[PDB]
């Protein structure tokens, strides 16, 4: 306008409805948020509805809804066992891990520095993507970025041309091991494809659950032993 | 997520706390009784073999005198129930029913906690144990003697 | 267009609705059938004199005050609510008054009658409780406009501390850029960055 | 659940074959065994560079290039 | 309209002498009620002020006054439940009914505020229930239960002996802050007394009548000097149906 | 029209929800047809009469039938030269003024329609209502499975009662006594003389049915007003249950849905009444009148 | 199908009591939540001009205080 | 063959009214195999088992509805409640299949701007199931699906409790989920 | 080139800097978030690998 | 629709403005025309009656209707479960 | 925030207002934008 | 016929009906308000040879 | 005629030498076509 | 109403056309509801000037 | 009561009319309908079983039992959302109150064994009041809870005056006090606000009234020899039906 100064002093702007709505209280609220897993996608008239991850026909999860631990554990709740329940707390809404490939074919591996250090005079950063014999780890196994694979084939087979990488082998293997991610020893990367690892862990933690149970049942045995040994 | 206020690396050599919690009672008892744990009040009572409820109610009305009569018994039951699983008895159950009933329709939007309580109310009826029996019958957890009885 | 909207027997406002009955600013009598909505006994009662106020002083009403005058029942906060009406009335099937009444009323209830997803601190209100008092005092029952200009001259002189100079938190005129970082980023187009810091 | 365009066909699966419709051809479509039937709508582009259905084409007795059949 | 008409106001057979001020002041109130009620629904919590099954337009008849009962209900119980929803919402005991907060944060210091709030909340609920606008003659399944306990070569005044015991323990409470309940102890009746911070569920007893001897509970109706008249009047507005049908499920 | 559709829909729902009686839709539509022929018989002679409007100062004289049929336009020849447009708008304003007049009489006779149809639906609501078995409660009472709880707001209403707690007093009694007073009068000194006066011959004519000759239209004798004591007359549900229960269920189902919707009408008329006189608020704030049930 | 359809990350990773304050056993879906009111507080602060990291701390400190 | 008796008027209704509690009388006939002159027979047990599992269809359905339908409107609202009642009513009484009836449920008309009303109430979309299961128990206790009322609720409750233990305990492969050609044991 | 009902169609490639795509809703409700139908780098000639 | 009460207010939407409804400015009180109820019996039939009532008498059972009017009640094992008490048509079987 | 609060009090004084007045300050850029201030930085 | 009329075919007829008034009631409703041309009159009174 | 079609005509395969023909395929084909048929009122409503 | 270049300010002719399209729609037989509004293509904030 | 011939076997209100004949009439000349002769166990058969007799019976019973009108919350009971009687809360409330009246409760606790004829020929003098009318309204007010009539209410005002005062002792200035006043002949307890008798309920269903009332068994609803009556009742115990 031209001359709005009078009533433009108390202008009544618009209210934050987007914020109000986003900050309403939701019947689906979660203490710790988790992005739901992918649904089955119709793969053709030959293949029907299959998920992509391994071909599941459902949505991999453990608990969907806000109640399904409470509803499962109702009578405990009405006798009052679920006031202190930490078994209804830690695992009220535990959803499965990102059991997938965030970037499957490996577009994000390696890290940008590694390219610039992937040249011919760089057997050090070459040999951190080749097998202990110089073999590339196959694309199904170590999914590399295509540019990485190109720079790497030419970098290895140029270093080998000028004789600055062994025509066979991996001279930087143990030094390279620090960069290569030691995974199946202690830490459990839930997105591993080794299932021996997952079974070690399921055992070891089932070992420990059985260990609680063992310790306390033998303590109760000891108690009933001390009964007759102390009173009679 | 590790729940709130629940300490993980808490030991027994870790000094005792002060909060009247089920976890606190259970760990203090782990220090105290060495290894006794009861699946309810009545495992402890089958261990004590003839100590009734009043037989500890009077003990504690004495032990701490500013408590009233039934309140001594209540401390009894509560320490039991807190180092155990809470008990299934017509006493507690009529407490719950009379109380929720005097409480009335609630302020959760869809009478939600009322429906939680009523889905509890009929979960401890005979009809529930009747149908639980019928369901188990459909599963054959029994034997010839059961059939005959 | 004020009369257009407010006279359709289902006038769903939004938080974008605002009725500029501001006529005389162009030197005309206000026009548009809203004058009788303003001369509704109900407004003259609820925010008295504000009836005369909107006519004479060019001021805009809004979603909230349009609601409180008792003007329109409906009010949305949804996106593309026209489309959400259209597809609902597609899925509808029977064209009998007993069926349209429900297939309609149900949408009014679900997306429009401000139930359980609303808040008065959330609606544009331009006669907010203070302003209601201001205006009932200043504008009600003064049979002229020179009347009102004397009656308001006084209320400019009444100092800040009087027992009738009611402050108000203001939904202040926002600035242009809301932040001084944005001010500097706006300036850097009119300048030449230097080739080192 | 099903599309309102039940079927839709081109008058010609070819472009090199323009099918000019006689006004009588287009009058023997709206005449199903004695029942006047404007059901299946046929689009034909007249000589006036207008694009009209066969119904307004035979209400003015002009026939046009065949464009589509649809119903 | 009942859903919009604000939560305390009273529509009327409008007088048609409704002045502009007459209308503008009540609208100003309703707009106040509107934002305080859009404020209640975010100050709000798990528990709520139990509704009562009877009118209290005037006083609960021949016992209490409109103003006196609106005092307790509207301020003191609303206080109790409001601090309960301050205190339980957000502690390891959240959102299971009073019957489980009481019992699992009972007899405890480190949660003393919690248990006090809980018990007082219930207490108010039960007094509310145990009233009734014109009193229930003690029923025939109940009077005999009280004959079995307090009949000592007696006449029809055995429930009168129990009223005697009611008034007796009303006055044998002195702090003038608390509750006197007739209960069923799991073996026999006894008019138990109650501090501020306890309930018959902390006491494990079956509440069969709820009396409120808080100084504030009769300050306005008769004052502290009319406590005996109040402990009497309460029996023209107690609900021996509630009492008796609780007693029967109590026994078996 | 919908005034009388609303009225008789609410009366239908009444004579059912206030007594287990159903009105026969044969009758329900004989009522509305009598109102529609009320309007046709007004419109008939309304089309033998004229309303005259006139534009500025009376230069254009538009002669019309009150229904709005422009019959004649006498014009001043200072108007033939305005334009084609302004001629249009001026004759249109003259038409509009005449229409205002005719519709003024039209609304002055639609109140006569209201009133004859009301004298008509009198003995029916007087039937359902002016019987010993007619009683309501206060609209605020929380009607419970076994009766009606009490209100809390606006204490001590004023329960009326339209009926003499004495013995029965019915309009047929009143009218028979009316003719008896009339008789004693036409016997009395002022009676027999006023009867020979114009004031008496005029009354005799405009109100003496038993004096219509053989042939004249109108009531040809004197009539007592009608008597339809609902709670003492099973109206239709008897016939419906005898013949077929299907029609019974649906006829009562409609009468009940009709009363239900007249209730919804009172509810929304009240809702605006409150948002007008400052009782209620434009969006729900008082949920506990719905959420505590 | 409309039926089968489907920041506070850090307001959680900094306080496990802030998450669960209505949602430990079953999301108490009608009481206003501390995570909620802290989101509201966060946005008010960041529009008052406090940087992201510092509004994080001030939100958490205001919560800890009101606890 | 599971051929139901084609009913009639008085005579079939005599045979049908004098039935009494078939589930019990089956149990009577099963146990009576414990008497001296009879043996406990798997055929009697299986007639009992089917006379008790008669309402398998309605129960498996309503359990799917409660627990596999993210965001089912307001089921306690009489609209969706009537969708539920009429569908489950015609799931028993065989007029509808489980699969088609579930599609009718998840497709019935609920509320305009449905996603928009949802994304206001639900973070991940999947609402609380208590309204759902209360609605379904109300369904089977309003419709006399069972002769002994608490049975409806008990099965409705326990089947849900038991499934609550499975991995992906709330996804069902649409083929095997309800009836079709090829099913699961 | 053909879009389903409940499936969102393409996002509009904003200007490069994408500071003002939220500043040009300054007229709008103050708190509006980023528009879901806006994009800095939506290129429909992007060849997927 | 008549059951679920929602929307029965619209038939009395005219009472938005009390003064206007009493004034009867526009006849258009009706949700669909001049009256709330004008031609409830014809005008609504204009829509292609895709889902018609059909046979809806509960006078005598589905079974007894099927039985009086059809040669299928005689042949019970033939009609599968869904169609059982339904048909009122005398089906001729032609074995191709 | 010290200097800005000083500035706000001085502004109120030279303005003829109390010091505890609810006052926000806003840059007025060379381009007729306005950009509120809250800090010392 | 199998003509499909667009949703608002009747607007022309509807405004002609909303506006057309009649000198009196009987011109408003008489049995020959249908009959417009000699074709209409003969197709009506063809049966009636008299 | 078992459907009641007074004015209709079905043709299959263009001619009875065109394979496949069989009593099965004939009954199946005609019933499939009668299924695919849309009513006129349904056509109209579909076009609104 | 599609008229943002003049802020939805209806000309005389446009209001004469609108008086007829409004009732042409509110007289059609398959009209249950008539959502009348302004199609501000991003060029105005006005409903009907 | 359908005029159709399939309806009358399953006597429709069998168990309810039984409850009413058990409660509100003497066991000496009265009826009782039996689920034995009643088809499906007397109760309705479950859903899947009967090919539709029980179906259409439930459906007619439904449509005749549906409640219509606005309720205390502003909705027909089948409005889309506004639920009533949630978890039977209305019968909960009506139990936790009962339809119990101060005035008749006091008349009881006063007479408490008297034969009503005895009391009536007492309170009616020779010419003061007619025993016919006073007995009539006495009964119709005693059972089948009504507001007591004018004459009978004044007779109560005089006769109960001691218990009336004992009710009227401890009132403060503001509370209600049972004031048997008939300023206007309006007997509606909302017109008196329930003071002319101690009634919550502005109009009680006569029969749910009489059901609670006859369950209050201080009246001699068993003409038997007394020690036999109490012996049978005790021995056959609390499940005597």
PDB file of C-alpha atoms in Angstrom, chain F residues 36 40 43-44 47-48 65 67-69 71 95, chain L residues 19-30:
ATOM      1  CA  UNK F  36     -51.893 -27.056  -0.093  1.00  0.00           C
ATOM      2  CA  UNK F  40     -54.656 -22.982  -3.973  1.00  0.00           C
ATOM      3  CA  UNK F  43     -54.211 -18.151  -4.974  1.00  0.00           C
ATOM      4  CA  UNK F  44     -57.407 -18.622  -6.964  1.00  0.00           C
ATOM      5  CA  UNK F  47     -55.599 -14.078  -9.325  1.00  0.00           C
ATOM      6  CA  UNK F  48     -58.820 -12.113  -9.757  1.00  0.00           C
ATOM      7  CA  UNK F  65     -51.633  -9.918 -10.215  1.00  0.00           C
ATOM      8  CA  UNK F  67     -48.712 -13.692  -7.767  1.00  0.00           C
ATOM      9  CA  UNK F  68     -46.495 -11.508  -9.905  1.00  0.00           C
ATOM     10  CA  UNK F  69     -48.006 -11.603 -13.365  1.00  0.00           C
ATOM     11  CA  UNK F  71     -50.629  -7.428 -16.903  1.00  0.00           C
ATOM     12  CA  UNK F  95     -42.729  -4.240 -11.186  1.00  0.00           C
TER      13      UNK F  95
ATOM     14  CA  UNK L  19     -39.728 -17.545 -13.915  1.00  0.00           C
ATOM     15  CA  UNK L  20     -42.762 -18.358 -16.053  1.00  0.00           C
ATOM     16  CA  UNK L  21     -45.839 -17.038 -14.257  1.00  0.00           C
ATOM     17  CA  UNK L  22     -49.390 -17.434 -15.476  1.00  0.00           C
ATOM     18  CA  UNK L  23     -52.306 -15.067 -15.728  1.00  0.00           C
ATOM     19  CA  UNK L  24     -54.183 -17.283 -13.304  1.00  0.00           C
ATOM     20  CA  UNK L  25     -54.046 -20.755 -11.842  1.00  0.00           C
ATOM     21  CA  UNK L  26     -55.824 -22.535 -14.695  1.00  0.00           C
ATOM     22  CA  UNK L  27     -53.370 -21.463 -17.355  1.00  0.00           C
ATOM     23  CA  UNK L  28     -50.722 -22.606 -14.893  1.00  0.00           C
ATOM     24  CA  UNK L  29     -52.197 -26.112 -14.838  1.00  0.00           C
ATOM     25  CA  UNK L  30     -54.460 -27.188 -17.647  1.00  0.00           C
TER      26      UNK L  30
END
